From a paper:
Complex formation with GFRP-Phe leads to increased activity at lower substrate concentrations and eliminates substrate cooperativity. Upon formation of the stimulatory complex, which implies association of phenylalanine-bound GFRP to GCH1, only minor conformational rearrangements occur. Attachment of GFRP leads to a slight twisting of the last β-strand of GCH1′s β-barrel and the central α-helix in anticlockwise direction. R235A-GCH1 cannot be stimulated by GFRP-Phe, consistent with the fact that, in the stimulatory complex, the side chain of R235 is involved in a hydrogen bonding interaction with the carbonyl oxygen of L40 of GFRP, which apparently is essential for complex formation. Again, conformational changes of the catalytically active GCH1 decamer between active GCH1 and the stimulatory GCH1−GFRP-Phe complex are small. GFRP seems to help stabilize the active conformation in each of the 10 individual active sites of GCH1, thereby reducing the cooperativity between the active sites and allowing for independent binding of substrate.
Guanosine triphosphate (GTP) cyclohydrolase I (GCH1) (EC:3.5.4.16) catalyzes the conversion of GTP to dihydroneopterin triphosphate (H2NTP). This reaction is the first and rate-limiting step involved in the de novo synthesis of tetrahydrobiopterin (BH4). The effects of GFRP on GCH1 occur via formation of heteromeric protein complexes between GCH1 and GFRP, which are dependent on the intracellular concentrations of the effector molecules phenylalanine or BH4. GCH1−GFRP complexes consist of one GCH1 decamer flanked by two pentameric GFRP complexes.
Author numbering:
A (entry chain G): 1 to 84
B (entry chain B), G (entry chain B): 63 to 114, 127 to 212, 222 to 249
C (entry chain A), E (entry chain A): 58 to 213, 222 to 249
D (entry chain E), F (entry chain E): 58 to 111, 126 to 215, 223 to 249
H (entry chain F), N (entry chain H): 1 to 83
I (entry chain D): 58 to 212, 223 to 249
J (entry chain J): 1 to 82
K (entry chain C), L (entry chain C): 68 to 115, 128 to 213, 222 to 249
């Protein structure tokens, strides 16, 4: 997938970091060590890692992804990445 | 099961009366082993039952339960809220949900989650919120809160719910 | 819409049905307290459903006023009496209405008439809540409308609360929060 | 007394009458929301009328929730019952008192009759020195204000000081 | 009694008078908010005085029921809306009624209708209080009647309370005390 | 503005109209209780419309009693006004604020207009950072339920945190 | 009298400002001698005025007065009751009675009696009862009560009055 | 028509994603499989898709659009794209 | 600061002005109920203005305590009695105070003394609100201070609010304060 | 005057869009079809258009402006152009 | 106990009272026992979705004046797989309140004890009390973990304790 | 004062506390001054239609345990040509409440002081208080003269103090 | 590249000042060029430099000094720009 | 470790500025003069400096970092830097 969205809540220094959805590249999710789950009552599955977002950003750079934008929305900090 | 276990419950309550230093033969205690056994069976009848665009709330639902740690009642109220998609919950079905789970040996946190999960499974709504407030007999009040779906993800939905249950 | 002629023509049929109910419950319809009950219950049921005799366009006659500048307009604690369509038992409570007009406002008594048309019918609380909100939205084309109904259902302390937020009441949380704060 | 068999046999007649009411009000009994209404309304009405199927201290049981039906208009009236008595040799168990209130309230009633029936039932059951019964209820016939009815029997009628103590203690 | 024909015939005269009042206050009767006020105020005044269209004997049709044994009967917190005859400004509040029947009782809704006939007139609180008490006494011939009216007079926090005690409510202080205790 | 002379000159015309109303309602204007009513009603109506004759803190004046007249039906509406503002260089004296509420409320009104007029008058008088006005009133047109109107100007509109502090402090 | 005495009152308030250690020339105190004098004249305007089958009660009449011992306001409510014979008191006349006596330098007991005597003299009723409740600025509340005629002689009349003023 | 605004609410992983307004390019709206609607009480029509925003971003790249900025506002996550 | 000697020396002067007021209102100063009024009114006025006899530095003696970790400190419903300087008529009500210490706290009775020093003077509510807030800020150097005064003016309630430091800058701190003072 | 700030509130799909302040270039404001107004109680005048912000962005590109940044603040969506 | 009784006996003499009068006869021992009961917290040790326990009655003693301060404690926490039994929570409030205290310290000690015992995501503690040595109420508030970091968690807690 | 301070210093040592810690440094003197303030009534003397003064705030100290009891006093009297000034009534409540007391004694002492000062037809005194050494409220009532002899006077008083 | 970053901000509305342009360690020459004043808002633990101008005017002035906007963000009721030379 | 996150709360003109987490480069943390701490109840350690964020940005430029993005979230102002 050319674009990726990652996020963390409450504090930027600590995980979990959300790294994917049902249409994410399964190989990249496995490379990040992500687990799949559906939070109670939600209509979608998500991939997450225990790592803080800075670790995930460093890993995604080694996979050719670059941060295009970072934004805060509610108590969520989101990064939008794109392959080169 | 109730008829078969009633004499065993009554024998245990008779034993309790003697172990407390009381006289089980005194007038006021003669029928107590059977009455206490029947009351305990009624308080736990929930084990005999099985599950089968607007914000919708049902607040101040009276709730009576038994604490599993000490076997002493805990009583209070349940406030429920949900954002339906295609299905809405009939008032009598909601009461049956609260009854099934509350009429068991419980912990307030488990009861709160079981009601929220039962509504989520029955309706498949956008989200559900459940707040239970109760006095544990074993002035102080325990308040437990479960927010699922959009009630957890969208703080504005949860805030509207908490404001409307006042 | 139901007419006064429809009421006169159907009154004996409603009375016959209520007399049949009295007999089917094991009661004596000839005892003093029940003698005129077929007609009293029939007339009461006609009154509880008198909203079928009214139309929203008739309520809207001379109902709209204009303003150069807008403000939040709320009418809270409007007493509401309705009939559950599932069990034919009343559900009673209150309606709180809020709207942010866009140059057109409803007269206060016409807003109350809007609650009356829809509540005086066989209803479900959710439909009643939406019909009031939609009628105001369509009549005034305001920036937004919020309607909260709270009622006790006699067929069931326990209260049902339904809430509809339209336009800016849905889109702008600050507008909705001001409304919910002011209805306390 | 009305039997469970009477209820099963009369349910379709109640449903037919409720269906006839829906048509006579100008409603469509075939619309989804009203399809099961004849049966739901019939069952609710049977439940509301299930009552036809059934020492030197002052003793009071106050704030007993009460649900009844006005016999003049067939609309509910709801509220509370406060009971007081001066026993002689017998005291009334709480569950038996609840059954007394339930038997008479779950009928087509007038609040005055309900008040007297509860007072007479306690007098006959216990043979006490006196009984007082106060019922307070909101009448849906009115709202669509509280009615308070009071019956004092035995020493509750004869001794104003007993009645005053009772009325003070039910606040 | 005032008829529906009397209302239709007198409505233009009431509207002409209210239009004259608008002009005499220095207001512009042609501005949007006042355009239909002559007719709205005339219709509202007719509604506030609709008790002149009713008669106590017509209210008493099917109003009386019998009982073998008596009890104290009270209906408290009956909302009341009336018009001061001295200033033509509303006075609003509550009516508390009590009676000790002597074998005849009024239907609850008929008691409310009695408050309605007399309150929906140009009144003085003292006359209204007595008319309700006298109507019940004459209709039922009970052992006694007590009526308490409490109202805020808009032409004036401050409340006027009037009290009439007839029959055993006057003669037996214990009956009056039970009534006053139960209306709290 | 309406003068004291205008009042004296128009009093008989108001009285004549009130006398005509008494006759048109089916009443007897010659009965003792109604003899002086044309003049008393006329004087009361003139009094109700006498309005036509006329720093780093948040500052609030709440629970200001308000009496007005609905212009649609000519029936009173009564309640309270809560005022808030963030001053720049000028603060409003309590008696001047009361005069503002009185001037606009003592007229034939709609609650929305009254709310805006008070907010605009404070804005123009003080030139503050912002003003908020909330009016809550019972409308006799309805009772024979509370209407709440709210106007936020300047920073009270632009900064939701200022408006929230104001709404919290007026409880 | 008001215009002639206003400068003397203002001179006295100016003197008070200096004797308290304050600066009468500071911006906030410049007009205080005149404003305090005008307020005191308004609080004592009652000296400019003169008196010229049911139980009837007017309760919760707001009352504002000045204590004569310390010159500090006392504020509260007046509840009045009477049993008329041939004359009934108009609401605005009753308000004028309370105003005339309260807008003076007073003691709560005198005020209570003056209102009761004015109603007795105006109406010649069977009896009058007056209860004043006030906070004296100089939480604690002073309650004074005067019962005249049948309100004193018949305890049942007084009891009905006291019950109905709740 | 070089600029585009797209958005999603509450969670970034799931749709609907808003992709247009009344004056949007109808061909691009059809290409995305968008539907037009006016939410109750709103004074405007909008185009939306059921897809989560990441899918829409991938589709828009194939049409020559690049993300210039992404921001949060209330419970809405917005992207500003440019071709 | 005003001294106890100043009070004894000026009490006869206050009594002469209150007697003159009694004569200027048309009252008889020689009637029984008014004989001691010049002195009682003079003593009451001195008591209402006793705040001029104290200084904030005197109140701050032994007033400060230290803590390793902070949290929100609120003292609500502090009864307040003051005199309006424009008309010399009391204004009475309550003061609600909140602060987030930065390692220094005030003893509870010392916080009450701060309200007393400023309220017992000829005042305007706005000045009183700010003086209390500034006194706490200067004494403790906290992260922030919030002061809300609500009063009835005897000459309907006036509510004044001052938010300083983080109580102004961080809306979440101010919101917690406003929620907890209900 | 190389920098420009534009904004919209509540929803991004609909105007009004704020496009200027008292010191804005009057010719550019006229080019956008903007009107001048002072919202009641505000201490400043503003220029606004009925168009949604996407239309304004397209128009500003034809005038040589480019979006440097976009942000949300409260219920306002702001663009900084150069 | 005898040293506390000797001190209370000495106080009764230093006030101008008659320690031999009926009402004061056993007061040195009763006052000593009451003071020991008010400070029994020094004898105890901590080793021996949203969850809230509100309106917990609290009795403590002001360390500055030795006069009681009484009120309520409201506690909230977001657990991480471990929950606190109601009697253990009461023991926590008791351990710290039954000492010579300042309301701020007591508030923090309860919050830290719950954080250490359960290792939750966060804890919030609000104490409200009337101080007899001063009507007015002192309210202190401690927010730890997500109760400090996430304002939405803190707001839900403050709403639910009403 | 130094003897009271020495006794409070001794109490701080007999509890297991550190009298040298910041919060307790000046406590022997602050506690001594608070206790002197609570017992200042021993320094004062009484020589230096229906009328009611209700909701008079009252603060006193239980003589059995030395723990405060706080509440309100409601006073009523029927004068005989002499009336009590409000500040003198407050001084009466103060003189007796600011001592080591039992609520019954304090109630009677206030009633007797008013009877002796005014020689009225009768006096009624009701005290309601919360006792910290115990929520529950203790209510004591003394009726003298016509307040005892005439039940109608007592009933009017009890009705008017609500 | 000496002191390359700058943060400026405005509150409530973007069209009107004050605009915050500095802190205690800001370049005194750049503060004087912008016409800024120094102040410590009551209760704050820091001094700030501010101007009456709306932020767009400040951005235009900072461009003439070699600064470029890298980012703009909203936080609470504050609109912030991060500039770099 | 090419990415860096820094942040400040409440006001941009004053510190503390958060500059690291448990996995941060301890040599860079020492270069910034940062201290390590775990705020009460938190499940993580953080590195912080007393300096306002503008000073930290200037220091990070001298270590080859550039600001890629700045955003507000709650009462926190965050910068995302890259080598
Ligand atoms: N619901 C998220 C905000 C969010 C909105 C849209 C997309 C992603 C996240 C929060 O409250 O933190
Ligand atoms: N109203 C949106 C925020 C928003 C404002 C402006 C434009 C776009 C979206 C929300 O509360 O989520
Ligand atoms: N007051 C704006 C936010 C804003 C702040 C700063 C600059 C511009 C806008 C709102 O609440 O939507
Ligand atoms: N305190 C600012 C937000 C902010 C946080 C961090 C840095 C800068 C500003 C506000 O509420 O508007
Ligand atoms: N909890 C932070 C916001 C935040 C969310 C996500 C990551 C970083 C910070 C605040 O309220 O200030
Ligand atoms: Zn248990
Ligand atoms: Zn139903
Ligand atoms: Zn009926
Ligand atoms: Zn009148
Ligand atoms: Zn009207
Ligand atoms: Zn005095
Ligand atoms: Zn003044
Ligand atoms: Zn202390
Ligand atoms: Zn004791």
């Amino acid at each position: 997938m050319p674009y990726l969205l990652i996020s963390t809540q409450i504090r930027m220094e600590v995980g979990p970091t959300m790294v994917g959805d049902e249409q994410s590249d399964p190989e990249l999710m496995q490379h990040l060590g992500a687990s799949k789950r559906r939070a109670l009552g939600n209509n979608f599955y998500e991939y997450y890692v225990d790592d803080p977002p800075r670790i995930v950003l460093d890993k995604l750079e080694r996979r050719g992804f670059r941060v295009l934008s970072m934004t805060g929305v509610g108590q969520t900090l989101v990064w939008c990445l794109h392959k080169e | 099961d109730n008829e078969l276990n009633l004499p065993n419950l009554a024998a245990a309550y008779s034993s309790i009366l003697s172990s407390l230093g009381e006289n089980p033969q005194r007038q006021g205690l003669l029928k107590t082993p059977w009455r206490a056994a029947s009351a305990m069976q009624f308080f736990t009848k929930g084990y005999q039952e099985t599950i089968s665009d607007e914000m919708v709330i049902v607040k101040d639902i009276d709730m009576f339960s038994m604490c599993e740690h000490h076997l002493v009642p805990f009583v209070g109220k349940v406030h429920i809220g949900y954002l339906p998609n295609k299905q809405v919950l009939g008032l009598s079905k909601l009461a049956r949900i609260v009854e099934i789970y509350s009429r068991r040996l419980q912990v307030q946190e488990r009861l709160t989650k079981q009601i929220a999960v039962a509504i989520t499974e029955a309706l498949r709504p956008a989200g559900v919120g459940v707040v239970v407030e109760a006095t544990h007999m074993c002035n102080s009040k325990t308040v437990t809160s479960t927010m699922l779906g959009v009630f957890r993800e969208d703080p504005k939905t949860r805030e509207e719910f908490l404001t409307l249950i006042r």
